[PDB]
Amino acid sequence: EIPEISLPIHPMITNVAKQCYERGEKPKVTDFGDKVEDPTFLNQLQSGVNRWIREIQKVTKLDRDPASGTALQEISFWLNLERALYRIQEKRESPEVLLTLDILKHGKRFHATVSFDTDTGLKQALETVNDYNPLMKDFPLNDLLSATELDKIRQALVAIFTHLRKIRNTKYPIQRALRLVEAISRDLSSQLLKVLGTRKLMHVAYEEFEKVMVACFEVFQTWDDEYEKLQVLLRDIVKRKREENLKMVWRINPAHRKLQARLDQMRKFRRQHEQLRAVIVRANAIEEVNLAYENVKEVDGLDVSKEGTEAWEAAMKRYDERIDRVETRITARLRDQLGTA
C-alpha cells in the first residue's frame, strides 16, 4: 500500500566506491580530485539529488480520505506510513547518499544539501509520525474482531476508547476523530450484522429474545455514555489547544442507530403481540389473530434496512391493519357479548 522507492546514484560514483570496496577503504570525498570542482559533474549530482527530493515528496505528503475503506484499513494505513517513513529515513542515512551530499558540500553547492532536509518534508513527516507512533502501536481492534457476545463488545468498546484516551497529548484533529468514530461504528455494525445472522432471532421465545434485546441496548448505552465522555474529552482538548472557532460538526449519524430505530419499532410491535398473545388465549378471534399475525409477519428476511422500509413499511402498517380488521369484530362483538344482558 505504500511506494518505497530507492534513491539511485550515478554509476561512476558506484564504480569508485566499488574500487574502494575491493580494498576496504572508506570512499573519501576527494577521491574524484579534480572531478569534484567541475561543472557537469556537480550538475549531474544535483540532478540525482533533485530527483531524490521528488521521490521523498512523492510519499511524504500522500493522503487519502480518512473514511475511505473500513476502520482497520485507515488505521493500518497510518501504521504503514509510520514504518515507511522510517524506511525513507533509512535510505537517507546511508553513507553513499551522504557521500553525494559531501560532494555537493565540498563543491560549495549548498542548495541541494540544505534542500535535502528542508525541501524534503521528511523531517516534519517523521515528527508527526512519531507523535502518532505510540497511538498506532498496540491498537485493541482485535478485541472487537472476535467479539460475538454483546458483553465482550461492551468491555471491548470501553477498552478501545480508554486506549484512545491518549489523543489529548498527541493533537488529534476534529473531523479526523469524527470519521474515526464513524469507522468504529462501521465495524460495530458489521459485527452486529453477523451476530444477528448467527442468532436465529426470528424463532426464539421472548425470554431469550428479551435477554438479547437488553444486551443490545447495553452495548448501545455503553456507546452513548462513553461517547459523551469522549465528547467532553475532545471539548477540553480543543480548549487546551486554543486554535479557532470552526463550525465542527458533532451531528454524527453513525452506523448503529440505523438498526436501533428498527429495534424500537419492534419493541412497540411486541407490545401489541404481548398484550394480545399473552392474553387472547383466554370466538375464533384468538386463533385468527395469531393466524393473521404470523401470516403478515413471517418474512422479515435477514431484516436489512433498505427492503425494511421499501416493502415492510406497507407490510408493517399492513400487519397493524390486519390486527385491526381482524380485531375489528371483537369491539362491536364485545358490545354484543355484554350489551344484550
Partner: protein, 370 residues
C-alpha cells in the same frame, strides 16, 4: 526546483557567466558577434558562419565584428540569442537551459522592453525555470561584503552611481551617463587618426581597445601634462608595426571626466558621484563619502582612483572624509556579487517562476523587479 542558478553577467562589451556558488567566473568572453567578411573558396574552410568566443577572437581577421548591445541596451536580439545560446554551448557550460534558474545582471534606468523581451527570450526559447533580473551596483556591494555605500561603475557602455543603503538601492539618486569604455576607445580611435595612424576596420577597432587597455593612463593634472611633450612610447601591433602615441594616451581616457571633448552636455564621473550623493538624504552624505566602491573595467586605468579622489575633493564639502575603495575584482564584481546573492536560500523566494511568468506575464517581472 532545478539544478543550480547560473549567474550570467551581461555587459555591453564582455559577458561573464558561470554557476552560482563559484568563486570566480569561469566563462568570460567579449560580447560581440563576428561573421566572415571574405569569400569561402577553398573547401575544408572554417565551417559555420557566426563565430563567438575564443574562435571568433582567434580568427579575428576574417570577421566583421559587431556588437548587439550598446549602452546597456540590446540593439539586435538575434545576435544576443546566439550569444546566450553560445553560453549554453559545449564550449562554455555544456548544460541545458531547462534545469537552471538564471540570475541576470542589468544596468539601471534601462527601458522596460529590455527586461520584457529578455524575459521572453529566456522563458520561451530557453525555457529557464526561473529568471531574476537585478541591478549591478547591489551586486557589487554584496561582493565587497559591506552594505551601505555608493557604487561607481563604468563598464563598456554605461556608467552610473547608485547610493545603496543596506540593500535598498535608492532609486532617486541613480545618476547615469552613457560614456563608458567602448566610447573611450572610440574617441581614442579618433585621436589615433589625428595622430596619423588610421584604424577603421571593425576588426581593428578591437586593436584600438587593446591599445586602450595597455597604453593609456590618467594624468593627475589635466592641463599641466597637456602643455608638455611626453616621452611618446611605442606600441607593437599584432601585425608587427610600431605606433608612437604621444599625447593621444592621456587625453583619450580624459573623456570620462569631461564629455565636452566628445561634444556632450553630460557630466564627468566625479560629477556623477557627487550628484548621486547630494541627491540623497543629508543624513547619509558622510556615510556615503566614507564608502565608495569602484567596479567595471573602465576603472582600471592608471591613476584613475587618484584622479577621482582629487576631483571629488574639489566637489565635496570641506573636511568630510572621502574614501574610495577599489577591489581587485572590478571586472568580476557584479559576477561575484551574483554568486553570493543567488547562492542563498532566499533566492528561491526572490526569483520569478516560469509558472508565474506564464500566468501574469511581463507585469509580474516589473512587479517583482527587486
Amino acid at each position: 526546483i532545478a539544478n543550480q542558478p547560473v549567474v550570467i553577467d551581461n555587459g555591453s562589451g564582455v559577458i561573464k557567466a558561470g554557476f552560482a556558488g563559484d568563486q570566480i567566473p569561469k566563462y568570460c568572453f567579449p560580447n560581440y558577434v563576428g561573421r566572415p567578411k571574405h569569400v569561402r573558396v577553398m573547401a575544408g574552410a572554417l565551417e559555420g558562419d557566426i563565430f563567438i568566443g575564443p574562435k571568433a577572437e582567434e580568427h579575428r581577421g576574417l570577421l566583421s565584428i559587431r556588437y548587439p548591445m550598446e549602452h546597456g541596451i540590446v540593439k539586435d536580439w538575434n545576435d544576443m540569442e546566439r550569444i546566450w545560446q553560445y553560453v549554453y554551448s559545449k564550449d562554455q557550460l555544456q548544460t541545458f537551459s531547462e534545469e537552471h534558474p538564471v540570475l541576470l545582471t542589468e544596468a539601471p534606468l534601462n527601458p522596460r522592453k529590455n527586461r520584457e523581451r529578455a524575459a521572453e527570450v529566456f522563458f520561451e526559447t530557453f525555457n529557464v525555470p526561473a529568471l531574476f533580473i537585478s541591478m549591478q551596483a547591489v551586486l557589487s556591494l554584496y561582493a565587497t561584503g559591506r552594505t551601505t555605500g555608493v557604487v561607481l561603475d563604468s563598464g563598456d557602455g554605461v556608467t552610473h552611481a547608485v547610493p545603496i543603503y543596506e540593500g535598498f538601492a535608492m532609486p532617486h539618486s541613480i545618476m547615469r551617463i552613457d560614456i563608458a569604455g567602448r566610447d573611450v576607445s572610440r574617441f581614442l580611435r579618433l585621436y589615433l587618426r589625428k595622430e596619423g595612424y588610421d584604424f577603421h576596420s571593425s576588426s581593428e577597432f578591437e586593436i584600438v581597445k587593446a591599445i586602450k587597455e595597455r597604453a593609456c593612463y590618467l594624468s593627475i593634472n589635466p592641463q599641466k601634462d597637456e602643455t608638455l611633450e611626453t616621452e611618446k612610447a611605442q606600441y607593437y601591433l599584432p601585425d608587427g608595426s610600431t605606433i608612437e602615441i604621444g599625447p593621444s594616451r592621456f587625453r583619450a581616457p580624459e573623456l570620462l571626466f569631461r564629455p565636452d571633448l566628445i561634444g556632450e552636455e553630460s557630466e564627468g564621473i566625479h560629477e556623477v558621484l557627487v550628484f548621486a550623493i547630494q541627491k540623497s538624504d543629508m543624513d547619509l552624505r558622510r556615510t556615503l563619502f566614507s564608502n565608495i566602491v569602484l567596479s567595471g573595467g573602465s576603472t582600471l586605468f592608471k591613476g584613475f582612483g587618484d584622479r577621482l579622489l582629487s576631483e571629488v575633493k574639489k566637489l565635496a564639502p570641506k573636511d568630510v572624509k572621502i574614501r574610495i575603495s577599489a577591489p581587485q575584482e572590478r571586472l568580476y564584481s557584479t559576477w561575484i556579487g551574483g554568486s553570493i546573492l543567488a547562492s542563498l536560500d532566499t533566492f528561491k523566494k526572490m526569483w520569478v517562476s516560469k509558472k508565474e511568468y506564464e500566468e501574469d506575464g511581463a507585469r509580474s517581472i516589473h512587479r517583482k523587479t527587486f
